[PDB]
Every structure is written in C-alpha cells, then in structure tokens.
C-alpha cells in the first residue's frame, strides 16, 4: 500500500503537496436567500471537484476499491468542506472566509433558514483552532483522518492501519514542536475531539441542505445533488 511504508515526514509533505487551492467566489460586490445560496452552492460545487482529486492523493486512498472511495467521499464531503472553511477563517476572528473575496460575519446569513446556527458553530470551531495555535501540518492530518474515518464503520482493516499511521504522524509533529509526553497526548485528544463537533456541524448542516425546501431555492449541480442524496 506504500502509504504504510512512508515515513512521518514523507506523509506530511505528501499531504501538504496535495492541498487544494483556495478558490474565489463569483465576483460582483453586491444578499438574499437566493443570492447567498447561489454563491455558496457554486463555490461548493467547484471545491468538490478539487476535493475528489485531493482525495486520490491522500496516501492509501487509491488502494481502496472504487466503491469504497465513493462511500468515504459521500460520507465526509461536507465535513471536509467545513474544516477547510474553519481553517482559512482562523486569521479572521468573528468571520468566515468562504473565499478571499467572500468574508462573512454571523449577521449576514440569517438571510437563510437554519444557516445562523451552523454559522455560529463554525466560528466557534475556528476560534478553538486559533486558541490552540493549529499548524498546517496538523490540519492536513486531521482532514485526511476525516476522509478515512467518517465512513469506515458504515462498511476497513487497511484503513485503520492508515489511521494509525496518521496518528503516528500527528504525534511526530508534536514531538518536533517541543511538546512534552503529557502535552502530546493531551493535544492529540483535544484535536480529535474537534472532529466530533465537525461531524455534528455536517450532520445538522446536511439536514437543512437536503430537504425539498432548500433544494428548491436555487438550481443545484448534478454532482452536488448526488452528494446530498447520498445522505438521504
């Protein structure tokens, strides 16, 4: 599987190198329910294309059957979008950086039913990351963990080997930062618990993002629609 054969540094560099670019939103500096979802669903659909190709570069993901690749991506796609959104919103306290030309606070977004609550949870996640001083090498590990873990018991032995590998990588990163043994497993735990909340945001987000009422506010792409239906 070669991914298991990788060293900790080899894993880190491979994950950093596979990082998708920060996309821009459709410009025009003009917000209703239709307009907000329009920009968001457009951005999400383009991000999905980059995510899928990113996943193929996650060490060990290629070794899975096509079916298993589909399942994991269908399960985790909104989680991965969100931890990405949370990541790039870190240096912007009180705001979500959907795109460099699309930076929003909580007041904008009550345009949309159910969006404010999810918004606040995202801001809370971002504030948590910043107070923990999350590093890039840690973030790429977490996002890869989401990919492999979130759909793994809806199936696995190989995936768990890789999960252990990323755990080894995370610990390796913390030891290099100068953390003590106690500080290492404390930080490891703190980070992994955030995944539980990211799952929660995705679940609550999905509940609003399918449902016919939200489906009808703006025509969605076939791809985005198929990713939504996978949770219904």
């Amino acid at each position: 599987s070669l991914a298991l054969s990788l060293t900790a540094d080899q894993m880190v560099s491979a994950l950093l190198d596979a990082e998708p670019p920060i996309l821009y939103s459709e410009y025009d500096p003009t917000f209703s329910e239709a307009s907000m979802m329009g920009l968001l669903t457009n951005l999400a659909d383009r991000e999905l294309v980059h995510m899928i190709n990113w996943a193929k570069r996650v060490p060990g993901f290629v070794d899975l059957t096509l079916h298993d690749q589909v399942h994991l991506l269908e399960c985790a796609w909104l989680e991965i979008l969100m931890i990405g959104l949370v990541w790039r919103s870190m240096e912007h306290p009180g705001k979500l950086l959907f795109a460099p030309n699309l930076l929003l606070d909580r007041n904008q977004g009550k345009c949309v039913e159910g969006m404010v609550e999810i918004f606040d949870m995202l801001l809370a996640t971002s504030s948590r990351f910043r107070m923990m001083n999350l590093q890039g090498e840690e973030f790429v590990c977490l996002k890869s963990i989401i990919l492999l873990n979130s759909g793994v018991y809806t199936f696995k032995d190989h995936i768990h080997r890789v999960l252990d590998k990323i755990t080894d990588t995370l610990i390796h990163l913390m030891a290099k930062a100068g953390l003590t043994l106690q500080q290492q497993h404390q930080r490891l735990a703190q980070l992994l618990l955030i995944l539980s909340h990211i799952r929660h945001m995705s679940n609550k987000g999905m509940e609003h993002l399918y449902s016919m009422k939200c489906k009808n506010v703006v025509p969605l792409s076939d791809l985005l629609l198929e990713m939504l239906d996978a949770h219904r």
Binding site: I52, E226, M227
Partner: peptide
C-alpha cells in the same frame, strides 16, 4: 453516478 467518473481520470 458522477463521482464514479471523477475518481477514475
């Protein structure tokens, strides 16, 4: 599905 296509290329 479309995801099938996007994963192969």
């Amino acid at each position: 599905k479309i995801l099938h296509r996007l994963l192969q290329d």
